Amino acid sequence: TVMEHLQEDSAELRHEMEELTDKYDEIRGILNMPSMQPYRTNQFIK
RNA sequence: UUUAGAAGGAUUGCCGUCAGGAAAUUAGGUGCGCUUAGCAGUGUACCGCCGGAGGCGG
């Protein structure tokens, strides 16, 4: 999977990555994603 | 004080045609049922008498 590639880049990705967007440094975002947090409640949660 | 509190599933319909189950057989030898006993609520409810339902004699 793409997930396992962005954990340890193998170029197999980096080769194919950098030739269509020139922006893989920004995308590699999908690594330190923020965690979901409970901040309020509504009438639809039990 | 409940994974709290809410809810229309609904209308219609052609399953059909045909057919060889079949041949063979040894269920057999034994055997202690057996002590005791009272059928009935009285064995029936009969003749009359008053008296417009309820009563009284033998």
Q: B8 C1' – A41 CA distance, angstroms?
A: 33
For residue A46, give the nucleotide whose C1' atom is nearest its CA.
Answer: B3
CA atoms within 13 A on the CB side of A34: 3
For the residues of chain A, what is the DSSP string, one character each?
-HHHHTTS--SHHHHHHHHHHS-HHHH---SSPPPP------TT--
- Cα(A3)–Cα(A43) distance, integer angstroms: 36
Distance CA A16, CA A29 (A): 18
Residue where the block lists tokens 């793409």? A2
In the block, residue with structure tokens 């950098």: A18
Those residues whose C-beta lies under 8 Å from the C-beta of residue A24, and which sit 6 or more positions away, are A14, A17, A18
The method of structure determination was cryo-EM
User: Chain B: nucleotides under 7 Å from a protein CB?
Assistant: 3-5
